Structures are given as C-alpha cells and as structure tokens.
C-alpha cells in the first residue's frame, strides 16, 4: 500500500537526527523523491576524489569510512556507520570532490539516495540545519587535518 510504504519511510526518516524536526511537507518531499541503492560487501558507495552531489542515509547494514592519509599507502579506517546515520553532505557544504571512501561492510547494505535538489529544498532550506551541518563539516575538517589526510 502506498500509505503503508510512506508511513514506514516517515517513521524511519523521523529517526534520523538531522531530519527529526523537519516540517511535514519537507519530510514528504524526501519521502517522494528518495531512491534506494543496494550494495554488496566491499562496494564503494562513495570513492574519495570523485565528483558527487548525492546525500546518503544508511537504511540497512554497516559501512566503513576510509581515507588516504600521509605516510600510508592504503586508505586508513576512520570509523564505521550504522542504520540511521548519514554521509556525503561534505561535498555539498565544502563544494568539493568526495573526501573519503564509504564502503559497504556486509552484503545487502541499503542506502537512501537524496539528490542535490531534494537536499537543497528540504534540509538546505532551514538555517538551523545549515548552520549545524557547517559546524559538523568544520569538525570533519579538523579531524582531516589532525590525521594528515591527503
Ligand atoms: N572528510 C571526511 N569525511 C568524513 C569523515 N567522517 C565521515 Br562519516 N565522513 C563522510 O565521508 C564522506 C565522503 O564524501 P563527502 O566528502 O561528500 O562527505 C563525507 C562525510 O559525509 C571524516 O573524518 N572526514
Ligand atoms: Ca560509529
Ligand atoms: Ca538559509
Ligand atoms: Ca568529533
Ligand atoms: Ca580536505
Ligand atoms: Na554509490
């Protein structure tokens, strides 16, 4: 049922920190425009250095965050993320290429894929959320500098 589907997505999206206080009409816009992409173990959802403008919410499974850093020939493992966490906002906020890899850690990982326009018309319309994400990205920049990210 369309209604049952939309209710399931509404309940999930309201469990995401960043989205919990969105007006109904903006949550409905996300519900209407999100897409789902599925990944197998080891797949790169995001690859450092590539262009990208999608915002992702992890809906099922776990992902690894890895990043190239000075003194290491392979990207180093920074953290892992789980259901309800999000990623890919930094390319939009920093106006940059992707700055880390996001790798599926297991099979049947599912992410919600939110394009730039949808992001801009929902999350990006609320100054409190923009300022929050600006501060979060600033902390990511601090972390990048402290580990000597390439
Ligand atoms: N640069 C950077 N990015 C991090 C970090 N942790 C995460 Br989650 N991320 C996420 O990894 C994504 C890679 O694509 P992005 O640069 O668009 O956004 C990044 C962030 O959402 C981090 O320490 N540094
Ligand atoms: Ca974690
Ligand atoms: Ca604004
Ligand atoms: Ca921190
Ligand atoms: Ca950087
Ligand atoms: Na992808």
UniProtKB/Swiss-Prot annotation:
Residues the entry annotates as binding 3',5'-cyclic GMP 2: 79, 88-91, 98-99, 144, 147
Compartments, record wording: Apical cell membrane
Record PTM text: Myristoylation mediates membrane localization.
Ranges where the record places region cGMP-binding, high affinity: 18-148
Organ and tissue specificity: Highly concentrated in brain, lung and intestinal mucosa.
Subunit structure: Interacts with GRIA1/GLUR1.
Disease (UniProt): Spondylometaphyseal dysplasia, Pagnamenta type: A form of spondylometaphyseal dysplasia, a group of short stature disorders distinguished by abnormalities in the vertebrae and the metaphyses of the tubular bones. SMDP is an autosomal recessive form characterized by short stature and mild platyspondyly with no disproportion between the limbs. Mild metaphyseal changes are present.
Assigned protein family: Belongs to the protein kinase superfamily. AGC Ser/Thr protein kinase family. cGMP subfamily.
Functional summary from the UniProt entry: Crucial regulator of intestinal secretion and bone growth. Phosphorylates and activates CFTR on the plasma membrane. Plays a key role in intestinal secretion by regulating cGMP-dependent translocation of CFTR in jejunum. Acts downstream of NMDAR to activate the plasma membrane accumulation of GRIA1/GLUR1 in synapse and increase synaptic plasticity. Acts as a regulator of gene expression and activator of the extracellular signal-regulated kinases MAPK3/ERK1 and MAPK1/ERK2 in mechanically stimulated osteoblasts.
Name of the featured protein: cGMP-dependent protein kinase 2
Gene: PRKG2
Full-protein positions shown: 269 to 418 of 762
